[PDB]
């Protein structure tokens, strides 16, 4: 209770002793290579480039109107920029569908992520199909509005009120503007201890510690993060050992597992010798895969029948044997 | 007055209680130092804390200066009624008195609305010791059944019960952990 | 208060924001007595004390103290619409006013302890697990039992 959110003590020990596929708080420490590792704003748009941004995080309200012709505009102000569009109207080939969708945008969450309506409207048109039409304002105005119409080439059952509310409540939750979908929140800090700094042999031959910007997430997907530019592919790690077993190998789970046991033992200032952590991590990963220390890891081994019966499944082991 | 800007990673509640816990936690270690520098040489608390037989430096501060601040579920004492902690205070009160800062000591005694809070904190610290022993005593059985026959053979190899090899030399060097010490190499560190 | 229709064990909770009134006559509730405060003064005058130290030959007791409207039973739900003053001599004076509209007052704030915790001298000086240790250890101290 007293110390982000990282599990320690007993529950992280019983997360490492078995191989629980959902650890209670996984993370992914992210190092940086070039100019992004020293300046704060380029670290800020690496931060924006990793964290997942769904569309409903940058919306104000959605209001379904009824304009049968785009020259009516019951909305009391929007005749100006659709009149700019009315100087040269485009895509009136089949009909005009009357049912409209209208999204207002919030510029704090928009300019926080260096987004604009041109790449949002690029994403929600190129990526969904051509079933919609996405018109929007100029960046001179204060309010950010984008009008959406359904494609007329079907009107030349599928009632479009239920359909248009269905894509309204599907584009709010399943649009993925930026980021990786497994990673929900990424922090940003530069360390004070020397175990997350960059240690360089200088020209004279001296160990120097350098402060670097590091990012650290809430959610793990390692293979997409290693494959991203301005990310150090050598030093990026995590704490989900089945995900390192998916991505890196088996020796990396030996060594990352040894590092995780050493991380939970040495948080209260204690000290256990190294022969014991090497023997446990070298027995747990000896036959190729993650032999979890439970019923289902040891009771599926080539040990005899009279050893498995003193561990939790006596009569079933005796009757299969 | 709607003038408190949040911090990166926190809500408004979290930046509020983090800086209030910052102020109050920085003002009970000061009283702790005022208690530590005001003892004597013939004292017996100090003659036990120094010698290392029993005691610690927070017990001298709680006995002499300030007991501290209690907390259940890892945060400051919660609104167990609606908008109050006990029915003596006023609704939506967030001060240090209303939510558990015990500003007296063990020798000046405790007020009632403060002895109740200290009973809450001591209760939580008693539940954790009451519960933890079953989980730890279950882990320590499951490991010892999973590893029980790994041993060192007459080849200095560390083999299983089925003789399938775990390590080629014990501890990756070949030595027993009874007779080793801390040393320093003193070749890696200095300049060229 | 003065016992016309309603037996003294009911509870009458009014939450103003929720806009409803709950009245409980059900059995099983737990409650404790308190002293009524008027405008700012108590209702337990000295006229109620000088004829209460005379119980052996006056026929005046706790039921005449309830039936006079100076104490009152309050339970747990009704202790969320209440405004207690923990002691009259220090919390109902004219000072820098914390609250000015108290509606009740406790008898003595050391009546929150049980039977085995009322045999500990100075419990406000001890660490509270030690109070929990002796509140389960004066149950096996050899003495005279009956």
């Amino acid at each position: 209770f007293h110390y982000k959110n990282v599990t320690l003590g007993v529950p992280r020990l019983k997360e490492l002793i078995n191989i629980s596929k959902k650890p209670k708080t996984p993370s992914l420490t992210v190092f940086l290579l070039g100019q992004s590792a020293r300046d704060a704003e380029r670290a800020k748009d690496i931060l924006c480039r990793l964290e997942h941004t769904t569309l409903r995080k940058v919306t104000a309200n959605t209001a379904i109107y009824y304009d049968p012709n785009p020259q009516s505009t019951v909305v009391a102000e929007d005749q100006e920029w659709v009149n700019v569009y009315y100087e040269m109207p485009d895509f009136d080939v089949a009909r005009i569908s009357p049912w409209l969708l209208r999204v207002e945008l919030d510029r704090k969450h928009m300019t926080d992520r260096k987004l604009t309506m041109e790449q949002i409207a690029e994403k929600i048109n190129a990526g969904f199909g051509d079933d919609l039409n996405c018109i929007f304002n100029d960046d001179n105005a204060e309010k950010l509005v984008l009008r959406i119409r359904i494609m007329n080439s079907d009107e030349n059952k599928m009632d479009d009120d239920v359909f248009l509310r269905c894509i309204e409540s599907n584009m709010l939750t399943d649009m993925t503007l930026q980021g990786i979908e497994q990673i929900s929140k990424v922090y940003m800090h530069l360390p004070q201890t020397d175990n997350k700094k960059k240690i360089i042999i200088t020209e004279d031959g001296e160990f120097k510690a350098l402060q670097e910007w590091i990012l650290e997430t809430d959610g793990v997907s390692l293979m997409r993060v290693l494959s991203e530019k301005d990310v150090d592919p050598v030093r990026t790690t995590s704490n989900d050992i089945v995900e390192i077993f998916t991505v890196l190998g088996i020796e990396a789970v030996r060594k990352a597992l040894e590092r995780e046991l050493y991380h939970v033992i040495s948080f209260d200032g204690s000290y256990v010798n190294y022969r014991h952590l090497a023997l446990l991590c070298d027995t747990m990963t000896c036959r190729g895969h993650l032999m979890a220390i439970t019923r289902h890891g040891v009771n599926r081994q080539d040990t005899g029948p009279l050893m498995k019966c003193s561990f939790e499944e006596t009569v079933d082991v005796l009757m299969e044997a | 007055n709607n003038e408190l800007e949040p911090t990166p990673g926190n809500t408004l509640r979290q930046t509020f209680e983090n800086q209030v816990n910052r102020i109050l936690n920085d003002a009970r270690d000061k009283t702790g130092s005022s208690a530590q520098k005001s003892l004597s040489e013939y004292n017996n608390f100090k003659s036990m804390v120094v010698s290392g037989a029993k005691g610690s430096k927070i017990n001298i501060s709680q006995v002499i200066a300030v007991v501290g601040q209690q907390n259940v579920e890892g945060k400051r004492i919660p609104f167990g009624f609606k908008h109050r902690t006990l029915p003596h205070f006023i609704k939506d009160d967030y001060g240090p008195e209303s939510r558990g800062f015990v500003e007296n000591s063990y020798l000046a005694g405790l007020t009632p609305t403060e002895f109740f809070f200290h009973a809450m904190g001591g209760r939580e610290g008693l539940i954790d010791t009451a519960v933890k022993t079953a989980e730890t005593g279950y882990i320590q059985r499951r490991l010892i059944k999973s590893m029980e026959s790994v041993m060192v053979k007459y080849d200095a190899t560390v083999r299983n019960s089925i003789n399938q090899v775990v390590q080629l030399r014990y501890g990756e060097d070949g030595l027993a952990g009874e007779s080793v010490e801390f040393q320093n190499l003193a070749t890696l560190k200095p300049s060229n | 208060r003065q016992m016309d229709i309603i037996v003294s064990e009911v509870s009458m909770i009014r939450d103003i924001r929720e806009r409803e009134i709950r009245i409980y006559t059900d059995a099983g509730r737990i409650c404790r007595p308190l002293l009524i405060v008027e405008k700012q003064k108590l209702l337990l005058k000295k006229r109620h004390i000088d004829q209460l130290k005379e119980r052996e030959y006056n026929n005046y007791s706790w039921q005449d103290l309830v039936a006079s409207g100076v104490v009152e039973y309050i339970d747990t739900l009704e202790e969320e619409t209440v405004m207690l003053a923990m002691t009259p001599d220090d919390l109902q004076e004219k000072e820098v006013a914390y609250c000015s509209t108290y509606t009740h007052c406790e008898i003595h704030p050391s009546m929150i302890l049980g039977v085995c915790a009322s045999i500990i001298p100075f419990p406000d000086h001890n660490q509270s697990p030690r109070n929990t240790y002796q509140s389960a250890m004066g149950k096996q101290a050899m003495g005279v039992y009956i």
């Binding site: 007293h2 | 927070i58 709680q62 501290g68 | -």
Partner: peptide, 8 residues
């Protein structure tokens, strides 16, 4: 019983 960083 001490503080948030200590013990209860």
């Amino acid at each position: 019983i001490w503080g948030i960083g200590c013990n209860p």
